[PDB]
Enzyme design. Structure first.
Site, short mmCIF file in Angstrom:
data_model
loop_
_atom_site.label_atom_id
_atom_site.label_comp_id
_atom_site.label_asym_id
_atom_site.label_seq_id
_atom_site.Cartn_x
_atom_site.Cartn_y
_atom_site.Cartn_z
N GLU A 182 -6.20 -7.13 -1.45
CA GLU A 182 -6.74 -6.90 -0.12
C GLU A 182 -8.08 -6.21 -0.22
O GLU A 182 -8.18 -5.14 -0.82
CB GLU A 182 -5.77 -6.03 0.67
CG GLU A 182 -6.01 -6.03 2.16
CD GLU A 182 -5.02 -5.14 2.88
OE1 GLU A 182 -5.46 -4.15 3.49
OE2 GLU A 182 -3.81 -5.44 2.81
N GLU A 197 0.81 -1.22 0.00
CA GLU A 197 0.00 0.00 0.00
C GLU A 197 0.85 1.28 0.00
O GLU A 197 0.99 1.94 1.02
CB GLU A 197 -0.99 -0.01 1.18
CG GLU A 197 -2.20 -0.89 0.93
CD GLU A 197 -3.35 -0.67 1.90
OE1 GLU A 197 -3.15 0.06 2.91
OE2 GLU A 197 -4.46 -1.23 1.66
NA NA Z 1 -4.69 -2.79 7.26
ZN LIG Z 2 -4.25 -2.68 4.07
#
Ligand code: NA
Ligand SMILES: [Zn+2]
Ligand SMILES: [Zn+2]
Ligand SMILES: [Zn+2]
Ligand SMILES: [Zn+2]
Length: 305
Positions: free
Chosen positions: A230, A138
């Site tokens: 995710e 991320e």
């Molecule tokens: Na997370």
């Molecule tokens: Zn995450």
């Protein structure tokens, strides 16, 4: 046959991930939580359940670097990752090796470590055909151009050792294809990573991320391969109330476009997104039924089809 036996050496074809005979395939499964916190949830018993009972195609092995992760014991964390890759393979699962950067959000902060780790993983597991490499979970607070240049630094380290493997590249704004930072997937298409057999990550949490996120995923899937490494059915914290109606819209879109996914997460963390009730892992299961949170029953039902 197992998922790995049925689809073989998966590779990007055009804008999709394909099996080894050019048929687009949608790999669906679960992400672990961080192995520095929830290693005890990953056992012979729990992984057998994921493969044989839940019918997952794929497991994402999430290794945080900061937050008491890899940086605290590179050798121990690497050895556990090798063990988990082998365990997943011995249960017929595809595996995503997730270099789980988050804070700091600039992937370059962990570049030197990433090259060391991925060089070791790629060399050891080069003969496998079921391992995909996720090089920056991320990215946040950084431009798309800087993520692209990071990717172009790490990709050759992997490809030198394991040329025929799929690499998943994180995107702007916590891998929201830029949506969370006021942009979108068109930015990627205009300046793509200069490598092939690449996919781009998208993450969403259905209770918080509504039509503008769903639209961006649709848009991206026209332009390049996307893997949802995710997602959750609750809010962006991974906790709170579920919105299964919104989540089902994402599921239907991903099925239509054969976009693979791994749900956050396969642990007994207290948060609603963790599929098991606290204490399940210490108790050795069960990995179904009364031990499942609502989100757990929902995803297990999706995976079982
Ligand atoms: Na997370
Ligand atoms: Zn995450
Ligand atoms: Zn077993
Ligand atoms: Zn801690
Ligand atoms: Zn290979």
């Amino acid at each position: 046959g197992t998922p790995v036996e049925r689809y073989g050496k998966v590779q990007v074809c055009g804008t999709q991930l394909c099996d080894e005979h050019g048929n687009p395939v949608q790999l669906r499964g679960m992400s672990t939580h961080g192995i520095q916190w929830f290693d005890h949830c990953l056992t012979d018993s729990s992984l057998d359940a994921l493969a044989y009972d839940w019918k997952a195609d794929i497991i994402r092995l999430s290794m945080y670097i900061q937050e008491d992760g890899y940086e605290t014991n590179p050798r121990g964390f690497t050895d556990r990752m090798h063990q988990l890759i082998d365990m997943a393979t011995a249960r017929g699962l595809y595996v995503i090796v997730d270099w789980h950067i988050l804070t700091p959000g600039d992937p370059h902060y962990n570049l030197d470590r990433a090259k060391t780790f991925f060089a070791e993983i790629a060399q050891r597991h080069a003969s496998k055909t079921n391992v995909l490499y996720e090089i920056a979970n991320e990215p946040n607070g950084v431009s798309w151009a800087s993520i692209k240049s990071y990717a172009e630094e790490v990709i050759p380290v992997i490809r030198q050792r394991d040329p025929d493997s799929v690499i998943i590249v994180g995107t702007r704004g916590w891998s929201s294809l830029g949506v969370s930072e006021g942009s979108g997937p068109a930015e990627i298409a205009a300046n793509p990573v200069n490598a092939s057999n690449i996919m781009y990550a998208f993450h969403f949490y259905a209770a918080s991320h509504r039509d503008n996120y769903l639209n961006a995923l649709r848009e991206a899937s026209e332009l390049f391969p996307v893997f949802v490494t995710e997602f959750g059915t609750e809010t962006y914290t991974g906790d709170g109330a579920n919105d299964f109606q919104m989540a089902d819209r994402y599921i239907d879109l991903m099925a239509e476009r054969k976009i693979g996914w791994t749900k956050w997460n396969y642990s007994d963390d207290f948060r609603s997104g963790a599929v098991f009730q606290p204490g399940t892992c210490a108790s050795g299961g069960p990995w179904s039924g009364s031990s499942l949170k609502a989100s757990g029953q929902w995803v297990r039902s999706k995976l079982q089809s």
